[PDB]
C-alpha cells in the first residue's frame, strides 16, 4: 500500500494473506474471505503454471504480519483457464480451504456486488494489504495492515490515459472490460498487495469491486493501478462457490 | 544464447547491437541489418513507452562486445502500434539510422522473407545474439557473440506445449499466429538475445524468419523460444522500409 | 544464533538490542544491561568511526523484535581507545542511557565476574541474541530472541584450529589474549547477535564471560564464535559503570 | 582506479592480472613482474586461508582485460607468514609462475627500492590497475587499464588523519611502519586495485614503493590509501626473489 495509514484491529474482517514455503512460510499475496470455506485472490499470485498444493498456507486477519500465526491448508486452487498474465486479463483465482472457518466479529466473509455495480468516480473506496509502500520499497518490520482511500477512475479514461507517452494505437485496449483503475500518485496498491481487495462503501454496506491485478509501477504519473473487476467473474465464483 | 558456440568471424554480417547511454554504453537487445539505413528489432526493446533518441545508439557487427565501437546515431524508432506486451504481440520495431551503412562483405542486410514463408519443422535456423547462456547467467567477458541451431516447431503444437504444466485453458491461445517457435531444453535464445534475428537457410538464401521476442525462461521443459513471426508484419515493415 | 532455539520469555532479563534509524529503527547489534543505567556491548557495532547519537536507540528484553518496541535514547558512547578492528582486539564499548532504567523481575542487569575469573572448557556456557541463524540467513519474522549452549574451547586450541588451512604462522597468534572461543559446526553465534552476551552459570550465578566479536563465517569447521574477554577488560569497565 | 585515466599502451609494462577460475577466468586482484619468474601481490590477494593453484591464473599487461588473455599458471604461492588481515599488517605475498617470462619492451620487471628510500612528503608516484573507479563503481568494459597520479603522505600525517572523527585513541597507530599512505579525496586506488603496484620515479629510474593494500572506502574525506611498504619486506622478498 502506497500512501494511507495502518487499518484500525477493527476494519477489513475479511483479509488474508497467502503463505508460499521455504526458509519460513512467506507472504506473497492477498486475498479475502468471501464465504467460510473460499477465499479470492488474483490469478497471477498462483499461476499460471501449476504450484504444489502443499507449498501454500492460508492465514487470515491479522494486525501484524507473522506475529500470530495460525495456518491453514488448502484442499483446491481454482484458477480462471482464461488466464495467462494480467495484462491479457482473468487474473482471478479461488482457494477452498481444507476447512470451513468459525466466522467473528474480528473475522468474516466480505460481500460481493451485485451484477450490476459499477463504481463511478466519487465513491468511498479503499485498498488493503501487506506489500510494498512504494516502488521497491518493502513494508517495514512489524509489518501492519495497511489501507488507503483510493479514487476510482472511469475505465475509458484510465485507458486513454495508459496510451500516454506509449507507442501503443489509441485504439488498442491496454485497460479491459473486465478490468477496473483506482489510485493517484500519492495513493495505490503495489507488489505484495497483488490479489487482496479494493472495498467500496455502497448504501450502508462494503461491496469488493475488485482484486489487486497490475500496473505500470506504482503512483506512478498517469498510471492508476488495475484491479480484476469483481462483476465480470461472478459467474465462475459462482460455479463453485455457494 | 544457450548452447552453441561462438561465432565465426564471417558469420552473420547483419548482427546489430542496441545500446543505452549509461555508465557506459551498454548493450540492452540485438538488432538485424534489412536495409543500408533500417534496423529490424522486438518492440519490447524499445516500448511500448516511448523514449528518448538521444539515449540510444546502433553498434554494427562486432565480434567482441564493447571491444572496438563504433556507435550510431538513430533518427527514427518506428514501434507497431498494436503493441503493448510480447505476450500480446505485434512485438516489432524499426529503427532508422541517422545515415545509411556502406554495406561491406563482413557487415550488409539480411534478406526478409516472402509472404508465403513458413518455415515449418525440419529447417535449418540460427538464433545469433550476446545474451545470456542460461536462466540469470550473463554472457562472460570478453562478450563473443554466440550462434545455437534451434528446431523450429509448428505453433499449434509448440502453443499446447505450453498449456503442459498450467492452468491456462486448452483452448485458450498462448502462443500466437504472429509468433513462431523454436529451441529445446539445450539450445535457445535468452536475455539479452531479444530483438535480434532467427535466419534459416532456404533453399541458398539466409532468411530472417523470427525475431526474438519472449518464452518462460530459456531452455526450460515445453517452453521452446517465441519469436515475433517476420511474415505477418511483412506489410507494416514495407510501409516504412523501402 | 546458529542451532538452538527460541528463548522462553523468563529467560536473559539482560539481553538489549539495538536500533539505527532508517525506514524503521533496525536492530544491528546484540548488548546487555549490567548496570541500571549502562549497557555492555562490542566496539565494531558503534565504531570504530565516531556516529551521531541520535541516531541510536536501545530495546531491553523484547521476546520478538519490532513487536512491542520501547525505544531509549543514549547520553553517551564509550568506546575503548585500542579499537580498531575485531581481529586485532578490544571489541568492546559502553553505552550510558538517558537515565536509569526502572529494573524490574524481567528486565534486569547481568553480573559481570571476578578477575581472576576463567571459564574454563566443559563449562555450562550459552550466547543469544536476533543475528542470522546461518551464513547469509537472516533470523526469519517474526525474529524471537534465539538462545544456543555452546562449548567453550581454550585459546590456544582454537588458535591451532584456526591455522588449519591457513598461510599464517603457527606461532602467530590468531585468537588473541583478550578474547575467548566457544561454539561449534552445530551451535555459534552469528552476524546481527555481535555485541551480545556469552554468560556461563558458575557456582549458582549467571556471569557474563563474553561479547559477540568475531569469526571465519559462522558454524563453519575449524572456526569456533570468537568473544571479547570480559575479564580482560575490567578495569576499563568499572572505570565507567559505578 | 578512482580520478586519473587510462594508461598509455608504452606504460606500466610490470602490470600484472590476477585471475580465479568460475564460469570465466575472472580477474580478482592486480599484481607487478618483480623477476622474469616471480610477481609482486598483496596477501589477502589469496590469503589467509590457503587456496587451490590450479584455481588460479596470471595474465602479464593488457590493454583490455579479457580481451586478449594469455594466462600462465602458478607453481609457488607464498604468502607472508605474518599475515591474517590487512589492517594487522604484511599484506604481502608472492606468486612463482610455472615457467620464466620472455621479457621485453612492451612488458618486463619493475625495480624494487634499496632497503633505505623513504619517498617524501608529496612526490609524484603513480598507481595502476583495473579496479573500481569509485565506492561501489566498477570499472566498465572494455576494462582498459587505468592509472593515476597520487600524493605521498608521511606516515605521521597519515595515521593523524586516520583518527580524526574516529573513537581509537590518539596513541594507537592504525597507520603502521610497514604501511605507507598515497592519495586524497579526487585520486586513489580502490578494490580491484589491490596487490598492484605504486610507483615513484626517483632518479630517472622507477621504483615500486607499495602494493595497493587498503583504506577506508576510496577517496574519502580524511583516509588516504594505504599500501604495503615494499622496502620494509626486502629481505622477505630477496629470500624467494634472485
Ligand atoms: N499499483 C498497481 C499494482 C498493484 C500490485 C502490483 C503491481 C506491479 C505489477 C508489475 N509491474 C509492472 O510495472 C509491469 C510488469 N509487466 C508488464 C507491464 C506492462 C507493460 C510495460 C512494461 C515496461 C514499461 C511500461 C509498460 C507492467 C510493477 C507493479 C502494480
Ligand atoms: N528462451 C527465449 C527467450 C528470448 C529472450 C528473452 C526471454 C525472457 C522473456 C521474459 N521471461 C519470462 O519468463 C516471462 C516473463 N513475463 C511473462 C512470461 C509469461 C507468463 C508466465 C509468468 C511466470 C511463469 C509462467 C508464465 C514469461 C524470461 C525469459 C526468453
Ligand atoms: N560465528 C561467530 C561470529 C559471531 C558474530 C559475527 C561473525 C562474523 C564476523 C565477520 N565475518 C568474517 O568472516 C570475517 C570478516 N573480516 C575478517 C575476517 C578475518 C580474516 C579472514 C578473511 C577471509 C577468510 C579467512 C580469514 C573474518 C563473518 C562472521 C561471526
Ligand atoms: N583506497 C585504498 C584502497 C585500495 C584497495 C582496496 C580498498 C578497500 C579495503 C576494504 N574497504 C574498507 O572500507 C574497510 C574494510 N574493513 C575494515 C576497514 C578498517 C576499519 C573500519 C571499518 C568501517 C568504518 C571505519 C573503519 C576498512 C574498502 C576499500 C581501499
Not at 91 to 97: G, K, Q, S, T, V
Request: net charge negative.
Amino acid at each position: 500500500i502506497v500512501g494511507g495509514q495502518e487499518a484500525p484491529r477493527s476494519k477489513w474482517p475479511w483479509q488474508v494473506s497467502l503463505r508460499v514455503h521455504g526458509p519460513y512460510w512467506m507472504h506473497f499475496c492477498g486475498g479475502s474471505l468471501i464465504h467460510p470455506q473460499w477465499v479470492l485472490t488474483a490469478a497471477h499470485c498462483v499461476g499460471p503454471d501449476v504450484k504444489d498444493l502443499a507449498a501454500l498456507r492460508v492465514q487470515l486477519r491479522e494486525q501484524h504480519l507473522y506475529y500470530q500465526d495460525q495456518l491453514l491448508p488448502v484442499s483446491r486452487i481454482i484458477v480462471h483457464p482464461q488466464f495467462y498474465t494480467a495484462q491479457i486479463g482473468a487474473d482471478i483465482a479461488l482457494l477452498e480451504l481444507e476447512e470451513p472457518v468459525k466466522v467473528s466479529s474480528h473475522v468474516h466473509t466480505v460481500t460481493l456486488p451485485p451484477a450490476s455495480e459499477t463504481f463511478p468516480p466519487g465513491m468511498p473506496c479503499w485498498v488493503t494489504g501487506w506489500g510494498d509502500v512504494d516502488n521497491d520499497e518493502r513494508l517495514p518490520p512489524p509489518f501492519p495492515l495497511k489501507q488507503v482511500k483510493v479514487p476510482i477512475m472511469e475505465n475509458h479514461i484510465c485507458d486513454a490515459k495508459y496510451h500516454l507517452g506509449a507507442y501503443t494505437g489509441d485504439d488498442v485496449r491496454i485497460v479491459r472490460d473486465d478490468m477496473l483503475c483506482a489510485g493517484n500518485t500519492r495513493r495505490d496498491s503495489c507488489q505484495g498487495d497483488s490479489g487482496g481487495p479494493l472495498v467500496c462503501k455502497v448504501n450502508g454496506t462494503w461491496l469488493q469491486a475488485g482484486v489487486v491485478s497490475w500496473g505500470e509501477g506504482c503512483a506512478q504519473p498517469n498510471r492508476p493501478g488495475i484491479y480484476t473487476r469483481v462483476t465480470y467473474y461472478l459467474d465462475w465464483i459462482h460455479h463453485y462457490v455457494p
